[PDB]
């Protein structure tokens, strides 16, 4: 990154740092939603069960014990997906601070 | 020689003798105490002091039974010298020889000190001199240095130092014992800045924040599980007793240059601690919150100004050449100005002075 | 509920406190950090105060403690009369 | 004048700040300490060319 505030200039590293700080704040609220869903899965609305399972006009057919097991494992996967992206984006923030300095 | 089982049975009996002795004195006004009961208990105490297999709790109940009989004598009953000198030796043993290890129960040494003080505060003045154990002042001075260094913990030694200083204040009723207080160096000992209780004896109270800081900085281990009411300082009472001791010792010793010397040396070491009680009258002149000036603090000034009124009776020219005589003149003028203000403001004396504790309130209610 | 509701508020970056919205909210509901925290400073830990065999023990301890308290009243009159008597004789 | 008036105000200890006094004074003279704060937070170095 060049000096200015051809190569790109250091405005690029600062804007990428801000967007990664914002995404790191979002995924930590979103993880704080996925762990709340996993702590109340037998007490979610039928609309939240449609919001997670999305199984078309088949959605009526599935029994409660079936839906609850399917949502409990979809929430395990999506917590692991999110905790992985939270690592990668924290490390982007440390790399960008190091590059700017 | 053969059964420990006799100890706890004798303890359950001394518990019962103690219970019955109290219930007798609290029920019959004693025109004359039973000298055979006092003799039987004096021998049983002397036997318990000869035999370290007998549990200290037995001796504590016998001492309690004797104390409850002794101050309930009428003020015209003198005790028989044969029973008194038997008691004074056994009471000296519980003061000279504390460490037979397990530590002793410090309540026994203190209870023996109170029974000894009560016996002094009942005698022919001329009889105490004919019953005095020579080693008693030397080992009371060791017990005082050890308790003013807190060697058994901040609440135990505070009671020990308090009790020894009251016993010493009752000994100051006698000239020849007060002469012995100078050569047992008990003023030179009270001039000593190595005595840990000095750190804990500036203020009449303790703050909320001191009590965690001054325990966490000491107890780094040994994991035993277990309107504002300001915790009036227990070591300030020891400072009040030290200043009262000097005001008793001065009276038989109006000719003693060793008293004038050791008093000058105490006034030299404790100078600015003795001045703090006067220069606080500058600090309240602007922004200090209206603290409830206690009768105990005005009595500390009654005592310290009397100590200066005593010192100004004896000072040879060499002391008048010290800045301390310019400083005492300054303190006397500061305090006379601030008192001339407060004695015009009679309203300051009628709003700000509250009798605080359950015992201060009780003394007003009794009188 | 503090942990839970904090995990529901989208608070801005603490470098970007939305003073336009805060000055709406702290006049709408009447909330005031410069009055609320100003009461709270004046409410500290020192604003608050505390107020068979065990019976035979507590009675025995009371017997000793009152006896020692009354000896400490006796010597407390004796010293004082003797002090004020000497304090008079000195000027005579 | 900030130095010469701040040295004339007997400000309380900032750990004992008297609630009722500013609650009178600010509503008397109009010194709303959220309005005055917003009207200052939206003035910065980047407000002047």
């Amino acid at each position: 990154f060049n000096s200015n505030l051809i190569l790109p200039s250091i405005d690029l590293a600062i804007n990428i740092l801000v967007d990664n700080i914002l995404q790191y704040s979002f995924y930590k609220v979103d993880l704080s939603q996925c762990f709340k869903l996993l702590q109340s899965y037998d007490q979610l609305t039928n609309y939240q069960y449609q919001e997670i399972l999305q199984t078309g006009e088949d959605y009526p057919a599935f029994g409660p014990t079936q839906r609850n097991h399917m949502v409990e494992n979809i929430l395990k996967e999506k917590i692991i997906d999110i905790e992985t992206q939270i690592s990668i984006i924290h490390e982007n923030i440390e790399i960008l601070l190091l590059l700017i300095v | 020689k053969t059964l420990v089982v006799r100890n706890d049975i004798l303890m359950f009996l001394c518990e019962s003798i103690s219970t019955a002795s109290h219930l007798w004195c609290k029920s019959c006004p004693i025109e004359s105490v039973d000298i055979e009961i006092l003799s039987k208990l004096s021998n049983l105490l002397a036997q318990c002091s000869s035999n370290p297999i007998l549990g200290h709790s037995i001796s504590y109940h016998i001492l309690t039974s004797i104390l409850i009989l002794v101050e309930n004598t009428s003020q015209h009953q003198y005790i028989e010298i044969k029973v008194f000198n038997q008691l004074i030796n056994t009471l000296s043993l519980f003061i000279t020889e504390p460490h037979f290890q397990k530590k002793p129960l410090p309540s026994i040494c203190n209870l023996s000190i109170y029974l000894l003080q009560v016996l002094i505060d009942r005698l022919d003045p001329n009889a105490l001199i004919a019953a005095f154990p020579n080693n008693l002042l030397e080992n009371l001075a060791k017990l005082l240095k050890n308790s003013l260094n807190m060697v058994n913990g901040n609440q135990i030694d505070n009671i020990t130092a308090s009790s020894v200083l009251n016993l010493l204040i009752s000994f100051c009723k006698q000239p020849l014992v007060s002469e012995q207080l100078l050569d047992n160096r008990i003023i030179q000992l009270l001039s000593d800045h190595s005595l840990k209780y000095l750190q804990f004896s500036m203020d009449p109270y303790l703050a909320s924040t001191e009590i965690s800081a001054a325990t966490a900085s000491i107890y780094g281990g040994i994991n035993y599980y277990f309107q504002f009411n300001q915790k009036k300082n227990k070591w300030h009472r020891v400072w009040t007793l030290v200043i009262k001791f000097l005001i008793s010792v001065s009276k038989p010793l109006e000719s003693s240059e060793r008293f004038i010397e050791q008093l000058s040396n105490f006034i030299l070491s404790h100078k600015d601690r003795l001045f703090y009680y006067f220069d606080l009258f500058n600090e309240f002149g602007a922004t200090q919150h209206s603290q409830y000036f206690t009768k105990q603090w005005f009595q500390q000034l009654e005592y310290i100004t009397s100590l200066f009124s005593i010192f100004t009776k004896y000072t040879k020219r060499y002391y008048l050449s010290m800045n301390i005589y310019r400083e005492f003149l300054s303190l006397a003028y500061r305090l006379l100005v601030s008192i001339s203000i407060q004695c015009s403001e009679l309203n300051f004396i009628e709003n700000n002075f509250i009798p605080i504790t359950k015992n201060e309130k009780h003394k007003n209610l009794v009188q | 509920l503090n942990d839970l509701t904090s995990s529901k508020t989208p608070f801005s970056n603490p470098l970007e406190p939305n003073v336009f919205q805060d000055s709406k909210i702290n006049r709408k509901y009447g909330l005031d950090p410069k009055v609320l925290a100003k009461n709270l400073s004046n409410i500290n830990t020192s604003s608050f105060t505390d107020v068979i065999d065990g019976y035979l023990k507590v009675q025995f301890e009371n017997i000793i403690l009152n006896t020692i308290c009354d000896i400490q009243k006796k010597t407390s009159k004796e010293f004082q009369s003797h002090y004020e008597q000497t304090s008079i004789h000195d000027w005579n």
Side-chain angles (χ1 to χ4, degrees), chain B residues 200-214:
Chain B
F200 303 98
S201 52
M202 290 298 250
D203 192 271
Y205 298 101
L206 296 172
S208 38
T209 48
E210 280 181 87
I211 295 168
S212 51

Side-chain angles (χ1 to χ4, degrees), chain B residues 51-275:
Chain B
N51 178 11
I53 303 176
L54 287 169
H56 294 91
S57 46
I58 306 174
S59 308
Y60 191 62
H61 272 294
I62 298 161
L63 280 164
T64 301
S65 305
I66 294 166
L67 181 65
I68 289 170
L69 291 166
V70 168
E71 194 68 284
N72 290 290
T73 57
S74 68
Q75 291 178 347
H76 303 280
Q77 282 206 300
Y78 301 93
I79 295 170
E80 228 303 317
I81 285 173
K82 204 188 182 191
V83 185
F84 169 57
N85 290 46
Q86 182 175 12
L87 280 167
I88 223 185
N89 294 357
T90 302
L91 292 168
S92 189
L93 218 80
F94 294 128
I95 295 169
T96 51
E97 296 181 295
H99 299 312
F100 289 74
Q101 292 151 287
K102 288 174 176 175
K103 279 193 177 188
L105 276 152
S107 54
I108 292 170
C109 184
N110 278 273
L111 188 66
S112 294
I113 287 163
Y114 276 106
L115 180 52
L116 181 61
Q117 191 188 4
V118 169
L119 289 167
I120 291 156
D121 302 333
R122 289 301 193 120
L123 274 165
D124 167 21
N126 312 269
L128 189 70
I129 303 164
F132 206 107
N134 301 10
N135 302 67
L136 181 61
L137 288 175
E138 188 243 9
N139 295 284
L140 285 170
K142 293 171 199 162
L143 185 64
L144 190 62
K145 185 154 185 160
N146 294 347
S147 54
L148 298 181
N149 283 294
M150 308 163 64
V151 176
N152 309 289
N154 305 16
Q155 182 157 259
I156 285 171
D157 300 297
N158 180 257
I159 299 169
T160 305
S162 295
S163 307
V164 175
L165 289 167
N166 285 260
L167 175 65
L168 289 174
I169 284 165
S170 291
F171 283 138
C172 301
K173 297 173 178 177
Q174 310 304 334
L176 287 163
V177 190
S178 306
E179 293 161 68
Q180 293 167 352
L181 298 176
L182 291 176
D183 296 8
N184 288 259
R185 300 176 179 248
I186 295 171
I187 304 178
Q188 189 175 33
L189 172 60
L190 291 169
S191 307
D192 183 352
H193 281 328
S194 68
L195 303 183
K196 292 189 175 187
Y197 95 105
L198 292 173
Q199 190 176 10
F200 303 98
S201 52
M202 290 298 250
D203 192 271
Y205 298 101
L206 296 172
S208 38
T209 48
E210 280 181 87
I211 295 168
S212 51
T215 49
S217 59
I218 303 184
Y219 294 93
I222 312 178
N223 304 11
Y224 284 99
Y225 304 94
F226 276 96
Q227 292 190 350
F228 211 65
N229 193 1
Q230 293 177 310
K231 294 173 181 174
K232 274 191 172 185
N233 188 351
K234 310 189 182 189
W235 293 114
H236 181 42
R237 185 182 179 181
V238 178
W239 185 233
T240 306
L241 289 168
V242 167
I243 304 302
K244 281 208 173 206
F245 172 71
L246 299 174
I247 296 165
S248 298
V249 176
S250 61
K251 305 182 181 191
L253 292 170
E254 300 242 306
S255 54
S256 183
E257 296 211 55
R258 290 185 186 167
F259 176 72
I260 298 159
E261 179 245 292
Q262 292 187 52
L263 177 62
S264 192
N265 295 335
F266 182 93
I267 287 174
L268 277 161
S269 71
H270 294 292
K271 173 187 152 158
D272 309 81
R273 162 168 287 202
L274 292 163
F275 291 9

Side-chain angles (χ1 to χ4, degrees), chain C residues 4-20:
Chain C
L4 192 96
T5 57
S6 301
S7 81
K8 291 182 182 181
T9 36
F11 278 110
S12 309
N13 175 2
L15 300 165
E16 302 169 59
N18 195 303
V19 203
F20 200 111

Side-chain angles (χ1 to χ4, degrees), chain A residues 74-86:
Chain A
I74 288 164
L75 288 171
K76 284 168 189 161
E77 280 270 86
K78 272 282 155 176
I79 288 165
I80 295 165
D81 307 335
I82 290 170
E83 289 191 312
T84 305
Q85 289 291 296
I86 286 168

Side-chain angles (χ1 to χ4, degrees), chain B residues 198-206 210 233 236 239 243 267 269-284 288 291 293 297-298 300-301 304-305 308 327-328 331-332 334-335 338:
Chain B
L198 292 173
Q199 190 176 10
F200 303 98
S201 52
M202 290 298 250
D203 192 271
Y205 298 101
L206 296 172
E210 280 181 87
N233 188 351
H236 181 42
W239 185 233
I243 304 302
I267 287 174
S269 71
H270 294 292
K271 173 187 152 158
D272 309 81
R273 162 168 287 202
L274 292 163
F275 291 9
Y276 176 56
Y277 284 81
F278 296 69
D279 283 336
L280 277 164
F281 287 92
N282 309 275
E283 303 172 40
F284 283 100
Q288 287 180 335
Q291 299 190 27
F293 286 101
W297 187 89
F298 268 87
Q300 201 75 5
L301 277 152
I304 296 167
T305 59
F308 303 170
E327 294 174 308
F328 283 140
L331 257 67
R334 280 185 170 150
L335 189 64
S338 302

Side-chain angles (χ1 to χ4, degrees), chain C residues 29-43:
Chain C
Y29 312 108
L31 298 173
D32 193 322
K34 298 174 184 176
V35 179
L36 291 168
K38 194 181 178 186
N39 290 273
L40 191 75
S41 53
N42 308 353
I43 306 167

